Coordinates of C-alpha atoms in Angstrom, one line a residue:
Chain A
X1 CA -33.8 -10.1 6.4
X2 CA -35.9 -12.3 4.3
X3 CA -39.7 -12.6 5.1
X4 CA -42.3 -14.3 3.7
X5 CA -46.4 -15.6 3.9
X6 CA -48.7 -17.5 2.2
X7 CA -52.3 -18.7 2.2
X8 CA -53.9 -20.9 -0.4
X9 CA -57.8 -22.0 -0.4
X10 CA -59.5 -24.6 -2.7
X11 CA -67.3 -11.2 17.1
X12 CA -67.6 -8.0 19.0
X13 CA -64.3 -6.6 19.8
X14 CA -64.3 -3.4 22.0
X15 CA -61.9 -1.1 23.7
X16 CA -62.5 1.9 25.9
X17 CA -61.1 4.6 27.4
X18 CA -61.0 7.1 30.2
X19 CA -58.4 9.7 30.8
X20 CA -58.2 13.2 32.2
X21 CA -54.5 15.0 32.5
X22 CA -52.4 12.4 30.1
X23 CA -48.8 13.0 29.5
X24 CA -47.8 10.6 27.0
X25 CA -44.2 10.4 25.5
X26 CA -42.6 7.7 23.3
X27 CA -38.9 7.7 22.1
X28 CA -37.2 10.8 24.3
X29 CA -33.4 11.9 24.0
X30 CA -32.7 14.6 26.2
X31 CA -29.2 16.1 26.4
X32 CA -27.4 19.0 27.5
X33 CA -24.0 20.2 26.5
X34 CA -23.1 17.1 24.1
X35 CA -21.2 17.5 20.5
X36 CA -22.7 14.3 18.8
X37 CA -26.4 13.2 19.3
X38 CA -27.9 10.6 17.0
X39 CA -31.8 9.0 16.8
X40 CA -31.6 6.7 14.0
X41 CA -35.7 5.1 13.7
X42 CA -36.3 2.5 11.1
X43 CA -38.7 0.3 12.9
X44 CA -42.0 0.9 13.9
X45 CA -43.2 3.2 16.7
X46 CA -46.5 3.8 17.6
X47 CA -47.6 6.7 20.2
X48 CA -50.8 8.1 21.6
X49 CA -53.4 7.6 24.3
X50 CA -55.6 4.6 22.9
X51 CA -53.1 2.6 20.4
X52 CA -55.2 0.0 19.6
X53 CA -54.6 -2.5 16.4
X54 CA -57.7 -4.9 15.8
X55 CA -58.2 -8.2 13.8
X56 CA -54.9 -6.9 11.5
X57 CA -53.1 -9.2 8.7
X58 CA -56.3 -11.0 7.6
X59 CA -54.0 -12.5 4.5
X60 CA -51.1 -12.3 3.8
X61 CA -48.3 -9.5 5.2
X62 CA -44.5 -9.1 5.6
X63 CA -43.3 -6.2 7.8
X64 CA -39.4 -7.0 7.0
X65 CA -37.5 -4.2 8.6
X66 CA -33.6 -4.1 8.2
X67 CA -31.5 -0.9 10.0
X68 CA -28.1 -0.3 10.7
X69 CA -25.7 2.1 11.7
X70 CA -21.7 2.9 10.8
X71 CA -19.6 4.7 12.7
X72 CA -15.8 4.9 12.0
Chain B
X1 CA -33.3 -13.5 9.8
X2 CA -35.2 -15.6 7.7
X3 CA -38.9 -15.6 8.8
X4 CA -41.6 -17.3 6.6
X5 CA -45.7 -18.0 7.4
X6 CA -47.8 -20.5 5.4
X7 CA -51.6 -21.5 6.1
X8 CA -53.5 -23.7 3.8
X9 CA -57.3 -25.0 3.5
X10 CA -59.1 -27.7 1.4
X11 CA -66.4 -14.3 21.1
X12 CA -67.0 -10.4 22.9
X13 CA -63.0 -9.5 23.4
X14 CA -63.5 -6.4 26.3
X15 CA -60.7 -4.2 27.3
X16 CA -61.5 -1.2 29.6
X17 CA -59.8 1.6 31.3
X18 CA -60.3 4.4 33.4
X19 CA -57.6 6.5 34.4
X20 CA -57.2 10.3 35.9
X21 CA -53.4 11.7 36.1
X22 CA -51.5 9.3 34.0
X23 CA -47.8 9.8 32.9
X24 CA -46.4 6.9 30.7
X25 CA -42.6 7.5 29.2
X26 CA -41.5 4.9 26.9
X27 CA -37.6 4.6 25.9
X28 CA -36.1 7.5 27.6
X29 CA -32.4 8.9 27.3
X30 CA -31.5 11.9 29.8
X31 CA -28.0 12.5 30.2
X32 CA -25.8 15.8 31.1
X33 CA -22.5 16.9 29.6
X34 CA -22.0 14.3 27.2
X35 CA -20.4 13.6 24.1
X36 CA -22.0 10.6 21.7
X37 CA -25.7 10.1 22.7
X38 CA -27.1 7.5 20.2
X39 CA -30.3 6.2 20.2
X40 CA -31.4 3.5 17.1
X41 CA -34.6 1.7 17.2
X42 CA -35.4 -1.0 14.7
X43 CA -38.2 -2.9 16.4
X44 CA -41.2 -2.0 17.3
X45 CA -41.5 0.5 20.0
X46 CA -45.7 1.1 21.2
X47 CA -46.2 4.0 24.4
X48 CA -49.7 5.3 25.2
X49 CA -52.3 4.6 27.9
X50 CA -54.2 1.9 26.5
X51 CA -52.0 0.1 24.1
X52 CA -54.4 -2.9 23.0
X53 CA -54.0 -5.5 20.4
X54 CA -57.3 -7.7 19.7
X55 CA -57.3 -10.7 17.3
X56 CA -54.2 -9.9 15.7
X57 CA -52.1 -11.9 12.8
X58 CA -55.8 -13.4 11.3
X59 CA -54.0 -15.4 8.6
X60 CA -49.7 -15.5 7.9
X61 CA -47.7 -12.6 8.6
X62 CA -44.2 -12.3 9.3
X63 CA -42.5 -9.0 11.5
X64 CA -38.6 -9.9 10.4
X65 CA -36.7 -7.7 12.0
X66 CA -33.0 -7.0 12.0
X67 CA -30.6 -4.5 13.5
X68 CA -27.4 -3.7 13.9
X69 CA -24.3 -0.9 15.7
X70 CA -21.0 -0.7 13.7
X71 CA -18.6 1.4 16.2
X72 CA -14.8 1.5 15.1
Chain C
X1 CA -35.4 -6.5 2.8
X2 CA -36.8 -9.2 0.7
X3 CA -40.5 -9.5 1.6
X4 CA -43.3 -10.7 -0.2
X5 CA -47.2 -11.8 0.7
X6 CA -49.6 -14.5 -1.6
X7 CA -53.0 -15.2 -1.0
X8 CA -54.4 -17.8 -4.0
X9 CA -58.1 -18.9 -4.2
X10 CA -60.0 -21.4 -6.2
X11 CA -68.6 -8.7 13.5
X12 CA -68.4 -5.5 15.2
X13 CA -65.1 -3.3 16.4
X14 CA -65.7 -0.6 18.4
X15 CA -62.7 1.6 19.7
X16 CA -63.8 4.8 21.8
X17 CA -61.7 7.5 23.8
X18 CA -62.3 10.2 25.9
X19 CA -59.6 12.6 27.4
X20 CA -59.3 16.3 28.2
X21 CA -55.7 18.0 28.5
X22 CA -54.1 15.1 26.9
X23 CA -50.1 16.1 25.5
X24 CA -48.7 13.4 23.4
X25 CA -45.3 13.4 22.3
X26 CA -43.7 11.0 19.8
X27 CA -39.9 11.2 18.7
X28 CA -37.8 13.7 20.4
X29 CA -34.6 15.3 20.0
X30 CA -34.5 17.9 22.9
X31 CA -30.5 19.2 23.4
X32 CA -28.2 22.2 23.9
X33 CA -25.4 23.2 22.9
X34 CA -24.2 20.8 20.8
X35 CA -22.5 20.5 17.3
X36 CA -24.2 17.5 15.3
X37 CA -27.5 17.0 15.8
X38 CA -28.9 14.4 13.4
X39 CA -32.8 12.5 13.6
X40 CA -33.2 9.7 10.9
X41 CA -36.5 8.4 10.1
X42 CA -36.8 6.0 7.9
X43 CA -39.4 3.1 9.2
X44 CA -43.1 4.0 10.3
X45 CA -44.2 6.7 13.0
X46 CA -47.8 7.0 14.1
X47 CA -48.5 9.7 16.3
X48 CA -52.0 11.1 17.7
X49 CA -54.1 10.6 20.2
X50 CA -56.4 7.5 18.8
X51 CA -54.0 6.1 16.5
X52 CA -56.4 2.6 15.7
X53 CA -55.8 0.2 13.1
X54 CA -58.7 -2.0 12.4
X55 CA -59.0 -4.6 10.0
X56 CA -55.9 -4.1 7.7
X57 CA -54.2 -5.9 5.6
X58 CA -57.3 -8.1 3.8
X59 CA -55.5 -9.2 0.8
X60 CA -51.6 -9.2 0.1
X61 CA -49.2 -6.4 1.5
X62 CA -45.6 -6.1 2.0
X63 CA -43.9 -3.1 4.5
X64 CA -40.4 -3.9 3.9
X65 CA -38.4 -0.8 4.6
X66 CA -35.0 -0.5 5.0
X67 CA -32.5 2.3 6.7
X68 CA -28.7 3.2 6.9
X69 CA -26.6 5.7 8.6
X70 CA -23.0 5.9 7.4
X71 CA -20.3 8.0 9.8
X72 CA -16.4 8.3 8.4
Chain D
X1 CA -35.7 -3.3 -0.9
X2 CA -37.5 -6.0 -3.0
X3 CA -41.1 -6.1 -2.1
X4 CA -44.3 -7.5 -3.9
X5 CA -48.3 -8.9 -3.6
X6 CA -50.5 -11.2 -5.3
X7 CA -54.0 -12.4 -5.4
X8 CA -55.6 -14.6 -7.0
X9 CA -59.3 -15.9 -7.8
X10 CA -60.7 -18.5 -10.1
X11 CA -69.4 -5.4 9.9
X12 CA -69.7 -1.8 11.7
X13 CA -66.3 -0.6 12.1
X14 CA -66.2 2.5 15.2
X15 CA -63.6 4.9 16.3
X16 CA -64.6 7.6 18.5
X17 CA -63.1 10.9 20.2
X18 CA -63.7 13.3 22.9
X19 CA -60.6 15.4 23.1
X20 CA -60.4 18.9 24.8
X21 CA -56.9 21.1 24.9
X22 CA -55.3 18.3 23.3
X23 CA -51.8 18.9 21.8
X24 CA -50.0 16.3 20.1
X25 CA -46.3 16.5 18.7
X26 CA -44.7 13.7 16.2
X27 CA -40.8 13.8 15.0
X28 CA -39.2 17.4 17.1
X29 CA -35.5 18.3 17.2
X30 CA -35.6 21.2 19.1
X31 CA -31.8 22.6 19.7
X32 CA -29.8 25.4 20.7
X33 CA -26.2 26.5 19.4
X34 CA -25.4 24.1 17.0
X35 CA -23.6 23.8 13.7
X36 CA -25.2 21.2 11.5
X37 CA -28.9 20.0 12.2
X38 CA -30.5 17.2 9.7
X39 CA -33.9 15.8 10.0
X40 CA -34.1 13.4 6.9
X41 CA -37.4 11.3 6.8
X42 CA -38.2 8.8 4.0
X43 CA -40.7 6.6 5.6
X44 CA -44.0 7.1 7.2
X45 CA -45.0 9.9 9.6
X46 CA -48.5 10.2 10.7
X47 CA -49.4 13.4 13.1
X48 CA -53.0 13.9 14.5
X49 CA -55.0 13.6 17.1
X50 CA -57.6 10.8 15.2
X51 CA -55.2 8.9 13.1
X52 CA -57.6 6.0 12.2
X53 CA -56.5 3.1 9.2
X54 CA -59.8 0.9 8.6
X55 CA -59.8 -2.1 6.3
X56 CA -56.5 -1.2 4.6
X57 CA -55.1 -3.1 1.9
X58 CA -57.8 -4.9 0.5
X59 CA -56.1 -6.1 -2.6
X60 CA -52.1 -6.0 -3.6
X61 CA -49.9 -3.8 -1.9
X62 CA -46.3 -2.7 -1.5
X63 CA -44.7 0.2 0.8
X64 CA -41.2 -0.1 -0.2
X65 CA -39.5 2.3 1.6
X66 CA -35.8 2.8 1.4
X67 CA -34.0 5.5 3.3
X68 CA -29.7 6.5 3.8
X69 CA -27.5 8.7 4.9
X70 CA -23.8 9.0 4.2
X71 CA -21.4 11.2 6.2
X72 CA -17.6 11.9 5.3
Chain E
X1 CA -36.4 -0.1 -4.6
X2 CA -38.3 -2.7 -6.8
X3 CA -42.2 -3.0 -5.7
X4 CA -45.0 -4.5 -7.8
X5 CA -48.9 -5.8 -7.2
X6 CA -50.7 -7.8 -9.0
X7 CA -54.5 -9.2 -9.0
X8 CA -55.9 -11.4 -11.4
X9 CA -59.6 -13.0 -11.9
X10 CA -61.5 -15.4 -13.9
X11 CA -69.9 -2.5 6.1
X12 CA -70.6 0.8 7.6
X13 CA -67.3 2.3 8.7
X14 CA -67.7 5.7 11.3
X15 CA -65.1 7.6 12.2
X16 CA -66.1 10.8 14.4
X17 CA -64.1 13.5 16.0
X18 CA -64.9 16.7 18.8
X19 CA -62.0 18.4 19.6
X20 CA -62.0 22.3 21.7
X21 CA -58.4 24.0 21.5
X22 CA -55.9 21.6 19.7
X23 CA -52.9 22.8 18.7
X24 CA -50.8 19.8 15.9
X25 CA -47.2 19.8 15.3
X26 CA -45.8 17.5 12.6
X27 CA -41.9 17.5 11.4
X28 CA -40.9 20.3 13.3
X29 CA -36.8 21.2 13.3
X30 CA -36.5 24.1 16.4
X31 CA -33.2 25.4 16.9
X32 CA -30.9 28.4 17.3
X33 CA -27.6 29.9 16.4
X34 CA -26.4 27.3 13.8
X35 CA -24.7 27.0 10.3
X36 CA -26.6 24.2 8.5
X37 CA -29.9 23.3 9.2
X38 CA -31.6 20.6 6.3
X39 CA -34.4 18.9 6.2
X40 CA -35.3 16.8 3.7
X41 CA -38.4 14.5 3.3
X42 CA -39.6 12.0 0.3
X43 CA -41.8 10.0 2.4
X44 CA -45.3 10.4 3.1
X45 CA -46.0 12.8 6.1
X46 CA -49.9 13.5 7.3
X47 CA -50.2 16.1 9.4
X48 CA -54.1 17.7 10.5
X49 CA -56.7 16.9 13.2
X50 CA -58.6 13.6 11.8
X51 CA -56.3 12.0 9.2
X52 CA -58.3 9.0 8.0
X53 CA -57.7 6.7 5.9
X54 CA -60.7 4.2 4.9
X55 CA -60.4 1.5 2.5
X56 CA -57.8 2.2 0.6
X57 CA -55.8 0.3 -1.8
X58 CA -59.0 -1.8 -3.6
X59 CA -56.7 -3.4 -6.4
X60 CA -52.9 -3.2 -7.1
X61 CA -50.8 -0.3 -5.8
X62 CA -47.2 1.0 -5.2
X63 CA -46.1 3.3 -2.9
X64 CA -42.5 2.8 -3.7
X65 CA -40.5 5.6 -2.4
X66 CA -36.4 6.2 -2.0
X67 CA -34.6 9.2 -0.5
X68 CA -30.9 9.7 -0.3
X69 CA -28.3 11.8 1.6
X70 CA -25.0 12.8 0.3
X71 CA -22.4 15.1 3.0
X72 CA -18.9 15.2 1.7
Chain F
X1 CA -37.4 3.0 -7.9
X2 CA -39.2 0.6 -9.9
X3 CA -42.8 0.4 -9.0
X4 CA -45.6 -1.3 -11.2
X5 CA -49.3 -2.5 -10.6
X6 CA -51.3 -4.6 -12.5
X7 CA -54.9 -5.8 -12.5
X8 CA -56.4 -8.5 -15.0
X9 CA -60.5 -9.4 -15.6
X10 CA -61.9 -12.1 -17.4
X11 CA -71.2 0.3 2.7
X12 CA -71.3 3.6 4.0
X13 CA -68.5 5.1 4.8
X14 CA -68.3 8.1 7.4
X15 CA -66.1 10.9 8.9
X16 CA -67.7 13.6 10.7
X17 CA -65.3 16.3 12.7
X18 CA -66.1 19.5 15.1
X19 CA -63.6 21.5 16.0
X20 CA -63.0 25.1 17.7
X21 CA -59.6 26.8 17.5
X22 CA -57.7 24.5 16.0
X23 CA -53.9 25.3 14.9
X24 CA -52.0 22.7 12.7
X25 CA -48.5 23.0 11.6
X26 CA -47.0 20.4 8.5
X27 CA -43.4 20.4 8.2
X28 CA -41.7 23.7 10.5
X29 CA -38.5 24.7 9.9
X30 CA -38.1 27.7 12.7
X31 CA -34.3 29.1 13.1
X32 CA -32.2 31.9 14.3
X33 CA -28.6 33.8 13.2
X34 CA -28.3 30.6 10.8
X35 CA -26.1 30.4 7.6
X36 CA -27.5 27.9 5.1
X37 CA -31.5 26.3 5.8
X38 CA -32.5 24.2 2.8
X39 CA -35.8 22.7 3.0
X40 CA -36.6 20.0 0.5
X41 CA -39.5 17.9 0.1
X42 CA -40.1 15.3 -2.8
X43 CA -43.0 12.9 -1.2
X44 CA -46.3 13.9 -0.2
X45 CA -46.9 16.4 2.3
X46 CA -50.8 16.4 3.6
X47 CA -51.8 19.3 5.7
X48 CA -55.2 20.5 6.8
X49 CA -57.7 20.0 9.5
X50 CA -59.7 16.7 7.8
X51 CA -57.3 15.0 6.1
X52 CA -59.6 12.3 4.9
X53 CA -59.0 9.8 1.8
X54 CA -61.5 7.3 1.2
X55 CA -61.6 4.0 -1.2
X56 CA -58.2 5.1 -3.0
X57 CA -56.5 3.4 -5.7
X58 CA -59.6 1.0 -6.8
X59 CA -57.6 0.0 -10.3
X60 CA -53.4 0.4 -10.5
X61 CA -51.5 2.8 -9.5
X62 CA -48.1 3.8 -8.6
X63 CA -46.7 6.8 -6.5
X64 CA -42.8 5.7 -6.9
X65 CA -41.2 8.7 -5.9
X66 CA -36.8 9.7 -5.6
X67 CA -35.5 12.3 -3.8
X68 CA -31.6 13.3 -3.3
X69 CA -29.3 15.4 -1.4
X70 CA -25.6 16.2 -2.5
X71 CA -23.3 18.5 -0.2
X72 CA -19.6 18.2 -1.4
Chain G
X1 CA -38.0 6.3 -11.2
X2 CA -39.8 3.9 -13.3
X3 CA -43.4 3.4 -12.6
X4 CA -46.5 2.0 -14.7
X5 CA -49.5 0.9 -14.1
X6 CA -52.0 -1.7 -16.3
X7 CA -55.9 -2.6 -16.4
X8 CA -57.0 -5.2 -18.7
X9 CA -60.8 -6.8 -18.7
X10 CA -62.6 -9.5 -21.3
X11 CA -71.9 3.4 -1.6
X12 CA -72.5 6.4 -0.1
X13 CA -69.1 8.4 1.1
X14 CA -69.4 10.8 3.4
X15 CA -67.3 13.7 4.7
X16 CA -68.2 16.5 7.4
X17 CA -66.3 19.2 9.2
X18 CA -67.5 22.1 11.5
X19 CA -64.7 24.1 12.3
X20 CA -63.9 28.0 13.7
X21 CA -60.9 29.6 14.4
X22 CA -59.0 27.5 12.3
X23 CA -55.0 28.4 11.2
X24 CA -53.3 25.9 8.9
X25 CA -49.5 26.0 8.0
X26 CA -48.1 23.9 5.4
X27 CA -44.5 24.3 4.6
X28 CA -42.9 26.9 6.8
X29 CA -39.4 27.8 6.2
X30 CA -38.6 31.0 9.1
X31 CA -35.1 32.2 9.8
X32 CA -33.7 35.7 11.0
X33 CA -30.3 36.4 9.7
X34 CA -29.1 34.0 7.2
X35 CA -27.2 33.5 4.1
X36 CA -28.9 31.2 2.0
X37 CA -32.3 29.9 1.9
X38 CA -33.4 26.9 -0.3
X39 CA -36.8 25.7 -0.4
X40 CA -37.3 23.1 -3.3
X41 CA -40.6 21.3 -3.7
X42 CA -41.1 18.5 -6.5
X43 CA -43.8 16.0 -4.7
X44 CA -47.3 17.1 -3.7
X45 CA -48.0 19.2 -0.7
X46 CA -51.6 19.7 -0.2
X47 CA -53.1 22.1 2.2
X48 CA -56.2 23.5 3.5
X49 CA -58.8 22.9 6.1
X50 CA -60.5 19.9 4.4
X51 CA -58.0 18.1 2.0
X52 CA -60.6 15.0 1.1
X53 CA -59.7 12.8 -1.8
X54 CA -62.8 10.3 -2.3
X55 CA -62.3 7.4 -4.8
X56 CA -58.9 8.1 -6.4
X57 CA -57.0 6.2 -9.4
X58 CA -60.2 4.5 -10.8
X59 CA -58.2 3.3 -13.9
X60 CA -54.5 3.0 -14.6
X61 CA -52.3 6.4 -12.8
X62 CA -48.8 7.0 -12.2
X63 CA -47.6 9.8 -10.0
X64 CA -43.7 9.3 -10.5
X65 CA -41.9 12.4 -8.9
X66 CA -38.0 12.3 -8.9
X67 CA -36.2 15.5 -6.8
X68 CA -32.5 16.3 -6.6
X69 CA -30.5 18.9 -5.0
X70 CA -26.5 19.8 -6.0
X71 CA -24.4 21.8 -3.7
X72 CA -20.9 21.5 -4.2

């Protein structure tokens, strides 16, 4: 999981919205009646009503993420 | 999962929305009378109403990602 | 997880929102009757309702993050 | 979990919000008749209902997170 | 866990909130008629009605964090 | 947990908030007819209505932090 | 848990809240009927209505926090 960046030297953005009676749900486990439940998160979850990311990583950026999971 | 960026040197963006009873569900897991229920996320995982992404990764970036499941 | 970001040397955003009765959920772990119930976190978990990112990462930045879940 | 930055040398930013009986939930483990519940978090949780990020990182940055969990 | 920054040499931003009856909920660990019930956290967890964060990180920074879980 | 900065030499910004009735939980740990409930925090918990931070860490800085858990 | 931080050398902010009927919960460790009850902190838990840090870690700072918990 190797990441990297480099950078060597020598606009209206708009976003709107509207909402009445949102119901908004992102990662869901529902069970009944189980004897092992697991929700192992080691990314990157974002959740809401407006999710808005503008004009991000100008430079330079890594965003090197590694999970994992064992079962014996 | 070797990821790497390199950059080197020598506009109105409009998103709109308008919404009135809105139910979004992102990963979802519903079970009944179970016995493992596992649920790993390692990515990148966005839920909302208005998910906007404007202008993004400007100069290098690099979003490695790597996951795994080990079940013996 | 090796990351790693260089940068060497030598316009309006406009995000709005408007909602009324507005239920956001992020990560959930909903369950009955079980035995082992287990919710690792370990990565990056934005929840809200105007969850914006504008303009990041200028200069030089490194997220790496790593996770693990061990079961004998 | 090795990360690192450098840098070297030799605009109206908006978010707005109109909310009314808004009720926002991040990371839940809601359970009934159990024996062990474990809710380990090591990264990056962010609960709100305006979670705004403008013109992070403007210089050298590292989130090096590391997170485990062992079970025998 | 190793992170490090380094930086060598030689805007209005607006963020506005009105919110009428909201009701946050962070890390929250819900349950009933169990033995162990832990919860451990060493990240960084924001939790409030307008969590903003505007130009942060100017120069070098580290936000190096590790957490561990032992069950035996 | 090694963190380190280093830094070597040789605009308006605004948050405004109006809120009525307002209820904001952190980290909950709610139970009942339980045996052992261990709550332990070692990063940085930030609760409140306005959680605002604003031009942080302008020189070096580090915020590495370790937490643990044994249960033999 | 090693950190450090070095500095070598050879704007109006503005924050505003309006709030009524405001309840704030931090920490909260509630249980009926138990046997043992642990609460350790050892980071930084902040809490309030209007938790504002403006213009932190000017200089050189190091805020290295190391936690541990035995049970055996």
């Amino acid at each position: 999981v190797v990441a990297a960046a480099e950078k060597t030297k020598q606009g209206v953005l708009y976003v709107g919205s509207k909402t009445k009676e949102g119901v908004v749900h992102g990662v869901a486990t529902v069970a009944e009646k189980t004897k092992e439940q697991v929700t192992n998160v080691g990314g990157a979850v974002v959740t809401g009503v407006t999710a808005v990311a503008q004009k991000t990583v100008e430079g330079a950026g890594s965003i090197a993420a590694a999970t994992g999971f064992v079962k014996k």
